[PDB]
Amino acid sequence: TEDMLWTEKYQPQTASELIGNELAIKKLHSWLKDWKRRAELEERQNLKGKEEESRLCNTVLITGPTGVGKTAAVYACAQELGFKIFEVNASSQRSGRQILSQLKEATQSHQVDKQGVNSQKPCFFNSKNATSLILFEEVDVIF
Amino acid sequence: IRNLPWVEKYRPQTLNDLISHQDILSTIQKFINEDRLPHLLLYGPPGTGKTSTILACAKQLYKDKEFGSMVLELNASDDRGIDIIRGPILSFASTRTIFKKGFKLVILDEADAMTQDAQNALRRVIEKFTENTRFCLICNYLSKIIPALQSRCT
């Protein structure tokens, strides 16, 4: 009476649920927590109105072997810290014009719906506040 | 002037001009005349009479005007891979001649030069379109043809 695979039935919903790679998990969680803090401070500055020392780079890269848990750790950290993942897989046509003109505004503009069921993380294809976060999955796969 | 080779000149235009194989020639003629021609796998050393056998069979089945439209002959060494199985072979096997109703013939000479994936698709082309067309594979080595493709043919 179950319709779910055991990978997504037992998917880690918390960064403490993943097995191994604790230093990499802590690094990614600290980076995403700093980004969430920057987003909340931006919201506070907006409310008030109406970077070598920080060294917060705009992009992390994650590498390792197949099936170790890179995507699972990314999704668990973004779920814990309230991010919304916009995923670009190799399983959809991602050429430069389409990915720019259909996902740049996720980074550059606010979320129109910030509360509700928006914690669900969608994908990209073309045939409490939640901060946007892009995830390019399997960047080495270039067609 | 013209001095044509004796290989071409003394060719068995009819199935009765072959000299050595007589059991399988009788079997092939009996496949022809009761309208039960299967997929064939003519294999052996060169110069034995496989191409001559299939050309006499196609002359027995089709005519001169419909020879250029009902039987298609390929050499797999000219272009290997599935760019020719998914392509001329698939479109030939899946289409139908407008007024000519019957069955088509594919003569795939030098089938052992075909790659493994091209054979893996040619077997499926054979399976899906058995009634529309028959396939005759001519080769030297049976060890260079996958058993799945061998088993569809006699």
Binding site: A90, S92, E138 | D117, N120, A121, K128
Partner: protein
């Protein structure tokens, strides 16, 4: 009007009409009876029973919903990167009403003939659409996958 070959006239229609590979065929039998089959790859020599067991398992799982819940692709089909991106993903996102425990099935026969780029483009499709769609692949050389 012709005599069907005995490989098709006597082709098995159930999972108990398959001789050899008793453990794996038994596991496929209990999965076909109970449901919720995972994404499987069946590797072996030619003529073993892989396509037969995959088709019988899909038939026993689906039943009358075979014509709408099953998408089968051989090596004679295209199965390219663009086919994986449009047709496979469109069938995976397609709504098909099925009894609980039964999923839509994408059968990829002769997975050795699939290009490496198409297999790379089919990686996430095997993952996200796993609550509605399952993948059953048959292959001879598992190293080509």
């Amino acid at each position: 009007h012709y005599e069907l070959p005995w490989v098709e006239k006597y082709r098995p229609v159930k999972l108990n009409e398959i001789v050899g590979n008793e453990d794996t065929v038994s596991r496929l039998e209990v999965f076909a009876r109970e449901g919720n089959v995972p994404n499987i790859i069946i590797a072996g020599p030619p003529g073993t029973g892989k396509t037969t067991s995959i088709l019988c398992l899909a038939r026993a799982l689906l039943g009358p919903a075979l014509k709408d819940a099953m998408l089968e692709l051989n090596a004679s089909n295209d199965r390219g990167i663009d086919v994986v991106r449009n047709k496979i993903k469109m069938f995976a996102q397609q709504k098909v009403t099925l009894p609980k425990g039964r999923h839509k099935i994408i059968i990829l026969d002769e997975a050795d003939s699939m290009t490496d780029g198409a297999q790379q483009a089919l990686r996430r499709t095997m993952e996200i659409y796993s609550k509605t769609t399952r993948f059953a692949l048959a292959c001879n050389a598992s190293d080509k996958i």
